[PDB]
Assembly symmetry: C4
Homo-oligomer: 171 residues x 4
């Protein structure tokens, strides 16, 4: 009931800003383009249970992440993000979901897709339906998040917790 999952996606998505909105309920706009392999942890109570939630952050400038073979290997669920203000990030989601399924333990591992930076209404480039459709072909939940607003952040992470808690219970 230590629960570990991994946040991943492209550089600029906002997976550092997103974990901090959840862990600490506020928004640091300052963030070095991550070089290392950090994590924030925090105790949650969901289904009247003990959850030491361990939120592992990754460097956006590699898919060598999930080649960690311990950090990725030890993780139980994945939180794939993209930026709703660059298409490139969104288009890679297929390649991400793909490489997860292959290099992961289970054939179908527990994933939640977030389209971040939703507050940037004026720079939106990914259309919501197309996103929802991509969520359909894979049958994984989708949330339009903002680490600036907090919109759907808690929902999104709580879903991933609920998914793997189900997986844990099914066993």
């Amino acid at each position: 009931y230590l629960i570990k999952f991994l946040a991943l996606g492209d550089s600029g998505v906002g997976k550092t800003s997103v974990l901090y909105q959840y862990t600490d309920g506020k928004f640091n706009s300052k963030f070095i383009t991550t070089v290392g392999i950090d994590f924030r942890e925090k105790t949650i109570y969901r289904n009247d249970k003990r959850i030491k939630l361990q939120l592992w952050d990754t460097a956006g400038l590699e898919r060598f992440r999930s080649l960690t073979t311990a950090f990725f290997r030890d993780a139980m669920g994945f939180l794939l993000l993209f930026d709703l203000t660059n298409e490139e990030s969104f288009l890679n989601v297929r390649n991400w979901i793909s490489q997860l399924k292959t290099h992961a333990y289970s054939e179908n591992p527990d994933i939640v897709l977030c389209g971040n930076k939703s507050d940037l209404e004026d720079e939106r480039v990914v259309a919501a339906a197309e996103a929802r459709q991509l969520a359909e072909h894979y049958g994984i939940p989708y949330f339009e998040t903002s680490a600036a607003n907090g919109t759907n952040i808690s929902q999104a992470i709580e879903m991933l917790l609920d998914l793997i808690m189900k997986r844990m219970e099914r066993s």
Copy 2:
């Protein structure tokens, strides 16, 4: 009938621009000198068959590529490029073809050499015969490509597909 091969060579050759000309039939002149380990995938029909072609790109600033021991190890053919406007790139091809043969699975693995940036007629430095000769000593196909024009791009990749499809069939 998922087919994986790896594009490699020196930094500036144009192996990112070349995969995008093939995948998407156009030319992005913008490309950050690759830091990560990306790939584009795409479904092709060659010999009335299902081809999920997986085009793996590498960072030009290492031969630590092919030390990937999974990414290189899992790949079935190699697409070695050089720039026809710097000799250094061309001269390394021997050292590349060399280190492939050694660190690869088969004694003779399936390779296609491309001399890229052929549109840069005014800055050409490698002479075509010398290139063809180098292709001779190793008995691997050679194409003078441009990611700007698309010239010989499709031909070149289709050849590499045809080679490993032959290898697959021979087994």
Copy 3:
């Protein structure tokens, strides 16, 4: 009686400046933000014995340190530092002490926490009690060090030497 330990913590703490104050008894204010994996060595006489002390320095821009699986794996004690003039460094100590216990050999390995840059009285941000309290919850020694002054440097390293010498003797 070659003794190896590893200095680690965040970028800017002063673990390069601290090893040099100890090895060489003076202060180089010049220090490139470490890119490699250096060490200083030096022969010491503690409990009337031969000590080839090997002081391994790490790059502050990773927890991929302690994933070294030889450099970290071969080390016998750890010297965790933080800067008393940025809270972030101090707050990570928990996450450091945590990840050490997990990825290390022994359940409880030999650690000494240093709060560096104590000379920067005017920019002090971590309160001494809170630091001492953090040392309490884990039961590991704590020193307020300066690589500029030398204050508590020798004490701190000599303690870590004494701890693992005890561990060696107990075996």
Copy 4:
């Protein structure tokens, strides 16, 4: 009778300029501070034999070199350089020779120490005797080299060839 050795030392020593003086008998003053893991090869005739000499270059900004566990592991001799115009480089030689002996195959592996940049007479900082003394305590050959002049370059590499050829013959 493929012979592999590895050139290593600190960033700025001149181990890229030195291999090129040997391979090609001239001096490129232009050299990006190496990021990757290159090698030059060349066929030599020493003791009336076939030598495919493989000269592996390393990035100066790590001792993670010799952690390559294939590139270092596959190498048969080592060519340690330092700059005669910075003491730091020279002082590390002990730590280099040390870490070689430990992480290498044989207890005493085949090493040749070069003090490079000897042409920079006006900026010389390491005194020749002190260098020769350091060579004495370890009993490995020493040459004062210049990649600018070619002075002692061929001698130095030919010695390392002769050493490991002896080791090969003794077996």
